[PDB]
Amino acid sequence: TVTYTNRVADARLGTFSQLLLQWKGSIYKLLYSEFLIFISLYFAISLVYRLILSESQRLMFEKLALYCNSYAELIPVSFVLGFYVSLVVSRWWAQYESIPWPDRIMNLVSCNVDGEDEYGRLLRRTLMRYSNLCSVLILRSVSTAVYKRFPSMEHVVRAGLMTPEEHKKFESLNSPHNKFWIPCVWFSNLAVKARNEGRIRDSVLLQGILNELNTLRSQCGRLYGYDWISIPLVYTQVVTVAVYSFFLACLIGRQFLDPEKAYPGHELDLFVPVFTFLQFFFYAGFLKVAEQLINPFGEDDDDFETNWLIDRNLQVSLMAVDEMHQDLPILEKDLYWN
Amino acid sequence: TVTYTNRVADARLGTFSQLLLQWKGSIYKLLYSEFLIFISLYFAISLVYRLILSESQRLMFEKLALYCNSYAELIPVSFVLGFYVSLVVSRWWAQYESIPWPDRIMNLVSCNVDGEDEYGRLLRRTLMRYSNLCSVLILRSVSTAVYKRFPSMEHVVRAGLMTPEEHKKFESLNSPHNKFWIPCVWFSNLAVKARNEGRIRDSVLLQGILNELNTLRSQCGRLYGYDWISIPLVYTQVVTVAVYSFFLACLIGRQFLDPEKAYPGHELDLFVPVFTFLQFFFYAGFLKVAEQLINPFGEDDDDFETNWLIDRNLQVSLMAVDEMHQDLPILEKDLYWN
Amino acid sequence: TVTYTNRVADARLGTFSQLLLQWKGSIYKLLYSEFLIFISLYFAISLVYRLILSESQRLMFEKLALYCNSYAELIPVSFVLGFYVSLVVSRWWAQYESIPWPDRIMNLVSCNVDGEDEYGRLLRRTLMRYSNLCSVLILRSVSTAVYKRFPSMEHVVRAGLMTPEEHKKFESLNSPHNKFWIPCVWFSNLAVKARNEGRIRDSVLLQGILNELNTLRSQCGRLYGYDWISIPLVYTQVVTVAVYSFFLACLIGRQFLDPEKAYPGHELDLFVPVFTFLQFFFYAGFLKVAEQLINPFGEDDDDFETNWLIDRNLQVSLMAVDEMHQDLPILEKDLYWN
Amino acid sequence: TVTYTNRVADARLGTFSQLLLQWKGSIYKLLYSEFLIFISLYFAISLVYRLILSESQRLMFEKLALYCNSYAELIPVSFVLGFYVSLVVSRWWAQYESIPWPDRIMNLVSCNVDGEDEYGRLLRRTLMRYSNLCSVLILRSVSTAVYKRFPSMEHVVRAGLMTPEEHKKFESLNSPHNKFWIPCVWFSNLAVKARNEGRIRDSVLLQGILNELNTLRSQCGRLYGYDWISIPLVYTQVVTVAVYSFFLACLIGRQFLDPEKAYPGHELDLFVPVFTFLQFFFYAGFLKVAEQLINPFGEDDDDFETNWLIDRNLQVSLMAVDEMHQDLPILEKDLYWN
Amino acid sequence: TVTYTNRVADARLGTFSQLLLQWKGSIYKLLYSEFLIFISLYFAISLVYRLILSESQRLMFEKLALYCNSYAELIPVSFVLGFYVSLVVSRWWAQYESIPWPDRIMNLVSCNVDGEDEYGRLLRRTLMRYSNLCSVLILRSVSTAVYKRFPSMEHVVRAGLMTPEEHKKFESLNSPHNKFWIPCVWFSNLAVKARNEGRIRDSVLLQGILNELNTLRSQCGRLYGYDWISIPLVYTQVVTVAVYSFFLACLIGRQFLDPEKAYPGHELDLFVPVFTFLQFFFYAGFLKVAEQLINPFGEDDDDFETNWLIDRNLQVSLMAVDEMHQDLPILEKDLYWN
Ligand SMILES: [Ca+2]
Ligand SMILES: [Ca+2]
Ligand SMILES: [Ca+2]
Ligand SMILES: [Ca+2]
Ligand SMILES: [Ca+2]
């Protein structure tokens, strides 16, 4: 993502005017190919009308340019595109909230799984590695940025997310479906094995760990839902005809006609339609935003930084359950005491 | 469903343009019958006006075509259809989230119901088979795709979802209503029977299993609500008059009139109304999407794959509580240790 | 309600066209009285203009018909009605979800309240009868269909929902307010009395029963909120002026004027305004839907079937805690065993 | 509030027509002062134009009346007011749901805090009086109807909500902020003192009481949020200019001009603009609803009855924990037994 | 924020009219710089047209002023700005609800962590200081008003939020990411250390404290999400072109043209466009509100008072766990006893 929240904290004059000079994650990078096609297709039809057509054939073009100008308003562009951008944005923030974070499990494994010896130290690191693995295996199913980092399961073993003894157990489990649910079952069987050896004290503390596992399992199930149940293809096909047929009609209808013929409306020749090129900037602008946010786990400039977030969650989890288990600072009287 | 999320991860040029060449789950398959009726009804009236009507009778058609062109805008098509598509889409994603998943019960039965012998192995499989049966019995009430797979309760016994001793107990329970709540009561009575025999250790662990049963019972109750409390029939009848009466008026009003009579607006004859056939493509396009998504448990190309999801949930549940009970991989020091 | 979900599972041709031939719960039953008043008021003014007014007085009517046609568009009908139908529909589904269901309490009372003797059998039936009574007493406050079934509290005793010893205790409790909260306090005092006699085993199992009581108490509190805090009367009065003053102006403005006077727009006489009668069908159509759904607990054809649902909840509750307490089917090896 | 839900249960003919004859809580009471100013300002300008201006000065008024009629449509009244009424209504129902109800705490204190002697009777009444006091102290901060009933804290002691020994402890606690959180801390310290004396049996039953305290603490925190974080003043100032500048332009632009001058549009003189006075009825109608619902805790006719609800919650709470502690009706076989 | 909720409790006449005379947090302070640029750019073009252009060059300006007046309506200002203000407002209230409050942890630490001696007094103050520190460290990442108060971590030690022994432990923990999660791990390790020393009685009471820690950890994670995942920059760049290009066209198109040339529409010269300056007041008015609310943690007049709220939460937390631990008022019979 491109974060600019620190720049728009106040509102003085050029609050948004300094943001339209930025290239990365901008409207100017998204529309740059579709704009130059629309400019070149416009100026081709303009130069053919002004140089190539004969006098008996220019008048045939003038009748089509007035027909296509009057009846292109029958294409309900704002109705069709306005409904579609509401679907993409409603699903956009709902998929950020479905990204699992280890920090609620991390608080409970760091304190309730006892032991400063090398076995309880191994037992807390394996729990938080199973919680991170249950999240990597769903992100490499829903994100093309995570999948290009981990193309095969051998790449997951090389990153330290999975030991080689766990890869043999992960392949011997024969299932034709997606196996992202495997480490979330290894977690709950290891947390019960930890209790039966005396590492977790009570069953109220065990069930509190198992409740945060199922919360993270529900987070992974939502990411599986938004990847599998797409926006309906019948909606995507309607909105790409509504935008493209509207500006296909604007290549004919928005031509500057001959002022000597004195048509109503076409009384001035300027050679560049500024208000048509602006109207392409907004109608095809919102279509290109919807193309970007329909899958926010790709490799756009403003998609979600999921390769970053895997690196954060692995380092923070194994820091809080290993280096921060009973390492507390000394209890001290603060500034306000009596 | 037709999933295309992997194809629209980035936004380069033809992000949505490559999706309008696909036939399965498309707008071209839905509108194919209504479009050819509207084309043929249009060209019939056009050829009757141009070949059959006399000169004193064409002028009567010209007056009706101008009346029906001016006052067909009194039909509030975008207001009526825009409200209706908001209802169908708001209920659409809310019914996907009501589909029950076994995976939260599956995590707790796989670890808390003890025993590696043949009785505790039988006890965990029967719990997860009652959770899957409490979901099949509501899906064959709300889905016509599941009902055509399981037309009678004898088909459920042949699929292994119900033993023949449970079908006798399911028929002896005399109730005139829907019996989808029966296996969710058998679950809670078997989980308490499991605790009283020592298989479940504490009552905190029993109540954690019973809380995930009632969460899955609330999921089945939402699917019962959306099937029984439909979108009101008075809304469905208004929107199918608003779309059909609008394009019934466009069979007369959008005719190409005689250019020799020099009417305002009808100065060009093209024999094919491109902007009327496009306007049918969007207004009757959104009506056909709403016809598809009003019951997303049918047999459309973009309805929910519920026969697939029953086969997934049965195989994954009986895998995690039978083959994955205490089968953990060996605890190993990972890549980051010291 | 009128359920048609089984008929619109697929979308072939006449998916919604077969639904506009149905009378029960239709737009044709709601608008039948307001339409015939609007037709008869229109044709009265039309026949008075064509037969009764003199030539010097018809020209006074022609000036008012052109004034009322041009400036009736100042009435913001779609803005006022479009906001109001959003309020009625947003509250409509939120009141279905507030209807309490016994099935989460029913799962926990059927398993955790022990005893096969006649006292534990009496103790489970009294708990589930207090949960159903705490729901009947709020439905007969919010529904006129339940109130006409149970006009007095003596009718509740005759239906078996309340024993005569409980009616004496229900009247001796002196409170000037609504007493729907009485059986939800009798539930929690009987569940603690059940634990202190050894019928409920632990306090974790007691608190799980008491948590589902307070969830059902929160359901009854939402039904009390939507009945008491109505849609504001100032909104209901504005929308019934916006629809009725608009079509009061259409009785004058949509008259067919004299074609011999050659007014702009009134060049054709057809004696029946098809696009005005259609415009009454949608603007007064959505007003009549909002009149139906503003209280979905009445006796309309598409209001909620609450007398049915009380009969379901009483039979299902006393079936699962009496006939299904420890009556489990025999544990059997299923089809997939080895 | 003005409740009319019992009157609109069905939809026959005059479902909403009988509601426009009611004065209390109506649009006719809200707009009565702004309407008579707008009528009198209109008829003053009309009588000055028809009686006072000279013939060379009436023509200057005719040019301004045509300028102000054409360009008053540049004021986006429906866009500005339609966004603002969505904010007021979205916050309106969310503040009713934030009003705390004692009935979930009331169910648990009435059963789990043991003792029929005068000390356990005193202990249950003090808990439910602290829960009601933690709600009165936030309602007299957010409601002007509760504050005029309890202007000082001495008025709270006179109503029985606070004993005089608790007022000394409430003043000795020195805090410069709002002290609505004080009785919610006294509750949790008294519930633990009740457990340490043996009145509450287990810690699972103690934590269930403390969880419903924090739910009621979260309800009071939401009422503190909506009172402190208002709708932004920049929104309130824009919408009161958009409505008032629009009808300031309608005092000039909607005048009936001279028919002898034959302006386009002003061909009929009627002396009363019915469609301008109706347009004031809806645009300034929705502004006056938003003025009423922006603080629903005031003293309007359709604000929330919070003085009523305090009197209900105090009587119902002290009834269920004192007169209904172990007072159960006799267990009896119901109508359906064998 | 600017609170005016106490002033709009009722709705009499000048309910909103008395609020448009206020300067702080007003539309007049936000638009004051952009308005004077738009006025001065308008009157410069007006005085150049009336004094500097020649007669053959004024007619060239008249043709551009009619072109830019007719086709500036192609810029979809209400569609582009209306979608953007819905995003800013939807995120606005969702970030107020993400601000963490200590009061649910404060209720449970004040009662369940035993001890009146100087060690249990030190133990409760350190828990509530870790909960407040876990909130300050995320607010100084998301707010520029908190960051200017605490620029470095040495400023946090000087305010009493962190003892100097905790700053050494906070720096020795080597992490390249944001460290707001550190005190929320110190909390859970100190609450378990408190239980193992006998200060917290049971594990049900420990897990209740740890559940409110993870609720406050989820609040801090939402504030991290809204700061990091901004509104997409491609949306911010489109709306600042849609507003600025529209009123760049209104500097030419809304000029008062020559009345002697008798153009359609430009028949009156008034030298001040009142309805253009009003149209700038609303379209650029809503843009400046969106500039203010896109980061509500800055230093605007109507941003969130977060430096105030830190001072409240620190004083209230250390008051309820130190001065209010077992300091209860005397149990007294209230006004309603027999
Ligand atoms: Ca993307
Ligand atoms: Ca379907
Ligand atoms: Ca009704
Ligand atoms: Ca008010
Ligand atoms: Ca700001």
Residue numbers in the entry:
A (entry chain B), B (entry chain A), C (entry chain E), D (entry chain D), E (entry chain C): 2 to 339
What does the primary publication say about this deposited structure?
W287 adopts one side chain rotamer to pack with F80 and F84 in the open conformation and a different side chain rotamer in the closed conformation that buttresses the space between adjacent neck helices. Because of its location and the conformational changes it undergoes, we hypothesized that W287 might propagate conformational changes in the Ca2+ clasp to the neck and thereby govern the conformation of the neck. Whilst BEST1345 W287F retained normal Cl- versus K+ selectivity, the W287F mutation constitutively activates the channel, making it nearly insensitive to the presence or absence of Ca2+. Approximately, 80% of the Cl- current level through BEST1345 W287F is maintained when Ca2+ was chelated with EGTA, whereas currents through wild type BEST1 drop to zero. To understand the molecular basis of this behavior, we determined cryo-EM structures of BEST1345 W287F in the presence and absence of Ca2+ at 2.7 Å and 3.0 Å resolutions, respectively. In the presence of Ca2+, BEST1345 W287F adopts an open conformation that is essentially indistinguishable from the open conformation observed for BEST1345 (Cα RMSD = 0.2 Å). Unlike BEST1345, 3D classification of the BEST1345 W287F dataset did not reveal a closed conformation, which indicates that essentially all of the particles are in an open conformation and that the open state is preferential for this mutant. Thus, in accord with the electrophysiological recordings, the W287F mutation decouples Ca2+ binding from the conformational changes in the neck that are observed for the wild type channel. Modeling of the W287F mutation on a closed conformation of the channel introduces a void behind the neck, which we hypothesize energetically disfavors the closed conformation.
BEST1-4 proteins are expressed in the plasma membrane and form Ca2+-activated Cl- channels by assembling as pentamers. The channel comprises five BEST1 subunits arranged symmetrically around a central ion pore that is ~95 Å long.
